[PDB]
């Protein structure tokens, strides 16, 4: 049971959907951190008593530390940069924050089958992939109680909420997953009475039955 969550990268699509879900279905107090949030996130999200908005970048240690002070859990919406992750890990360290859920990309560990892997890496900038590797590495090298969610290709569909969790090392065959399904998985992890399965683990999140060579239309 967590009451106070800080969402880093709060303007991202999954982060905004998570925020709405937490406001609608929990009594959690939410702190949103990111650039220009009061302008980038809509009113139905930030105009709630249980929402606190703090504007700043990951290169703003003062504001970042403010945002995570007394957080019981921290959600990192984007693990795109080694430097940014190091700043995040340092801020958490200084504020004695232990629990972190972060979103990364599936495929970095060679877990996709051949066709899906080739399509994936021909459709992402190299710099994006490299930054994701570095961010992952920084978090894994920390002493945080982290859960990394390795997401396959994202799309939006309110009717598609099914997910499965793919353990580290297992072949990851799902070519897509909806952002709504990922949000349900995050919600479910936040509500896990026994956190053991998520303690310093890296878990794939995919839509069951999407064993394709590339994501669908």
User: Which residues bind to Cl ion, rule: CB under 5 A?
Assistant: 9, 11-14, 34
Report helix, strand or coil for 145: strand
In total, the chain counts a number of residues equal to 217
Cα separation of 94 and 217, whole Å? Answer: 45
Name which of 86 and 200 has its Cβ closer to Cl ion.
86
Helix (H) or strand (E) holding 194: none
- Closest CB to Cl ion among residues 13, 70: 13
Query: Kind and range of the H or E element at 162?
Result: none
The nearest distance, CB 41 to Cl ion, in angstroms, is 8
CB closer to Cl ion, 62 vs 110:
62
Rounded Cα gap, residues 199 and 207, in angstroms? 23
Q: Which is nearer to Cl ion, 77 or 82 (CB)?
A: 77
| Residues in CB range of 37: below 8 A, 6 or more apart | 10, 11, 46, 53, 54, 55
Question: Toward Cl ion, which CB reaches closer, 10 or 28?
Answer: 10
Q: How far is the CB of 51 from Cl ion (least distance, A)?
A: 14
CB of 13 to Cl ion, least distance (A): 4
Q: Which residue is nearest to Cl ion (CB)?
A: 34
Q: 2 CB contacts (<8 Å, ≥6 apart)?
A: 28, 72, 73, 99, 190
Nearest distance from C-beta of residue 168 to Cl ion, angstroms: 22
Q: How many CB atoms lie within 10 A of CB 141?
A: 11
CB of 9 to Cl ion, least distance (A): 4
């Amino acid at each position: 049971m967590y009451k106070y969550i800080t969402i880093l990268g709060a303007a991202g699509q999954i982060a905004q959907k998570l925020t709405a879900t937490l406001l609608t279905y929990t009594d959690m107090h939410i702190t949103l951190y990111g650039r220009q949030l009061k302008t980038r996130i809509p009113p139905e999200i930030i105009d709630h008593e249980r929402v606190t908005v703090i504007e700043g970048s990951f290169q703003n240690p003062g504001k970042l530390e403010q945002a995570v002070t007394n957080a019981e859990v921290v959600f990192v919406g984007a693990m795109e940069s080694g430097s940014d992750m190091a700043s995040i890990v340092k801020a958490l360290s200084r504020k004695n924050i232990r629990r972190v859920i972060g979103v990364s990309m599936a495929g970095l560990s060679g877990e996709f089958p051949v066709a899906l892997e080739k399509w994936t890496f021909d459709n992402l900038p190299i710099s994006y992939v490299q930054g994701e590797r570095q961010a992952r590495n920084v978090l894994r090298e920390s002493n945080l109680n982290y859960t990394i969610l390795r997401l396959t290709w994202l799309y939006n569909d309110p009717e598609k909420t099914d997910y499965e969790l793919i353990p580290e090392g297992a072949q990851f065959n799902d070519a897509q997953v909806s952002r709504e399904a990922v949000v349900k998985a995050i919600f479910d992890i936040l509500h896990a009475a026994d956190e053991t399965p998520f303690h310093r683990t890296s878990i794939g999140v995919g839509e069951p039955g999407t064993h394709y060579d590339k994501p669908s239309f």
